[PDB]
Amino acid sequence: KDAWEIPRESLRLEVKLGQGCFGEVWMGTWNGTTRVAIKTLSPEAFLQEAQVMKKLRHEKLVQLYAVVSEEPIYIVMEYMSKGCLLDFLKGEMGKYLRLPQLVDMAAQIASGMAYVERMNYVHRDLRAANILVGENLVCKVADFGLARLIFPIKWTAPEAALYGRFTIKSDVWSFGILLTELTTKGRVPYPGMVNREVLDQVERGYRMPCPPECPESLHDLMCQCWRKDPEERPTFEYLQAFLEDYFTSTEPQYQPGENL
Numbered sequence: 001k002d003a004w005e006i007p008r009e010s011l012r013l014e015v016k017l018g019q020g021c022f023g024e025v026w027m028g029t030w031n032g033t034t035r036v037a038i039k040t041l042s043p044e045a046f047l048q049e050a051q052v053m054k055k056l057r058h059e060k061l062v063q064l065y066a067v068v069s070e071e072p073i074y075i076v077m078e079y080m081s082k083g084c085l086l087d088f089l090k091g092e093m094g095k096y097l098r099l100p101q102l103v104d105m106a107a108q109i110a111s112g113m114a115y116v117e118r119m120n121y122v123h124r125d126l127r128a129a130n131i132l133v134g135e136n137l138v139c140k141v142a143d144f145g146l147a148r149l150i151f152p153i154k155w156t157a158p159e160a161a162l163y164g165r166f167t168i169k170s171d172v173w174s175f176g177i178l179l180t181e182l183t184t185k186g187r188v189p190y191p192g193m194v195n196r197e198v199l200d201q202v203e204r205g206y207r208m209p210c211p212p213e214c215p216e217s218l219h220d221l222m223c224q225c226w227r228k229d230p231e232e233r234p235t236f237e238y239l240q241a242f243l244e245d246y247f248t249s250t251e252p253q254y255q256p257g258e259n260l
């Protein structure tokens with residue numbers, strides 16, 4: 001057992017905030033007067049996630065803090081006040097998010113994902129459900145299960161979905177798809193397309209259209225995201241940089257609109 005391991009004690013669970021799939025997510029207080037997030041639930045399968053999170057630190061990736069390696073097993077990490085980006089965009093505070101905010105958030109996540117590019121790590125689950133928001137419109141990557149050193153198809157790339165080939169380039173696919181919700185106020189992609197329709201449609205060569213009120217600027221970008229050859233797709237250094245400089249070098253004339 002290692003430095004990351006802690007006594008089951010000094011941590012109680014104040015609240016319960018999730019448990020959609022297998023386990024539980026509460027928000028307690030830790031190690032004195034420290035607020036945390038705890039995940040609960042091959043008892044090891046659950047912790048393959050922090051074995052990964054152990055090796056990664058970035059300010060735009062939710063951070064681990066401790067993990068109770070023994071059952072009842074838990075993973076302690078940094079609490080993010082504003083739930084997950086999905087609920088956030090669909091929900092009440094999402095009404096007043098215009099492009100600037102929406103593009104901003106994007107970059108933070110590109111940025112964390114640029115780092116993931118650095119460490120030769122892959123996330124096979126990039127979707128606004130796996131991004132957590134904080135005070136200040138701070139967004140960080142999460143859901144570190146599924147991640148290894150280098151399966152819904154709306155969010156997933158074809159090579160991977162079909163042949164299991166999961167690059168960072170396949171994470172990149174998911175980023176484009178995610179851009180749309182960011183700009184769709186949380187909508188499920190491929191509206192009215194079912195998981196069979198989506199597969200050869202997407203093979204058919206077919207990409208989503210410009211979300212209403214979007215700038216084609218961001219659409220050629222997503223589009224670049226969905227290129228069929230995984231290796232001509234951009235990267236998170238490129239995306240991150242493109243995203244940050246966007247309203248000065250990209251759309252430096254953008255004017256505010258009703259819904260964006």
Ligand SMILES: C=CC(=O)Nc1ccc2c(Nc3cc[nH]n3)nc(-c3ccccc3)nc2c1
Pocket residue numbers: 017018019020025037062077078079080081082083084132
């Ligand atoms: C009006 C509703 C509201 O504020 N709800 C909140 C707030 C914070 C949540 C949160 N924070 C976490 C989780 C991991 N780090 N921070 N995490 C989670 C969560 C995350 C994964 C699975 C289930 C729940 N939900 C939150 C919900």
